[PDB]
RNA sequence: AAACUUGAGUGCAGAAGAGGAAAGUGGAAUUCCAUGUGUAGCGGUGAAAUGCGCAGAGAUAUGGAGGAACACCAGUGGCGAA
């Protein structure tokens, strides 16, 4: 029931709509996750830096209960809550060994959706 | 009718180019499908809802299938009659 993973990876997906934080082992197996939506943030509040922090703190705390002490951070997306999430991991007591940006970029690939005229 | 070389061509020696046609080879990303981890949302908006998910979604890891387009370079840069 209790795992013992000392070293793990924290994945922060920050979008204009939401922030999701999943903490995984180095092999990509998930330990815990939290989101602005999961904590009951709604609408504009979901994308706020505060909501991102609270999501990060919740996910970190649960992961530490599995014995995680050190984390490597991977960030994806352009949302406002990326930095707050990274600070929250440190605040939760996990140590951030490395921070890396993994947001996907095509080398001129698929056609994007139409621009919103309104 | 007879000359001439300046126009227009030819030769010779150089120069650059997303000019065109046909094969072949890549890497990024999207979608789908398959499994592992995992959990109560995800997604979306001015705000919502429809939708998707709890028959395990989204996320994360790995593998496979397929199509389309070629980041950076890249510039009143280049090439072409358009």
UniProtKB/Swiss-Prot annotation:
Part of the 30S ribosomal subunit. Interacts with proteins S7 and S18. Binds to IF-3. GO terms for biological process: translation. Belongs to the universal ribosomal protein uS11 family. It comes from the Bacteria. GO terms for cellular component: cytosolic small ribosomal subunit. Pfam families: Ribosomal_S11 (PF00411). Disulfide bonds: none annotated. Located on the platform of the 30S subunit, it bridges several disparate RNA helices of the 16S rRNA. Forms part of the Shine-Dalgarno cleft in the 70S ribosome. This is Small ribosomal subunit protein uS11. The keyword Calcium does not apply. The keyword Disulfide bond does not apply. Keywords: Ribonucleoprotein, Ribosomal protein, RNA-binding, rRNA-binding. GO terms for molecular function: rRNA binding; structural constituent of ribosome.
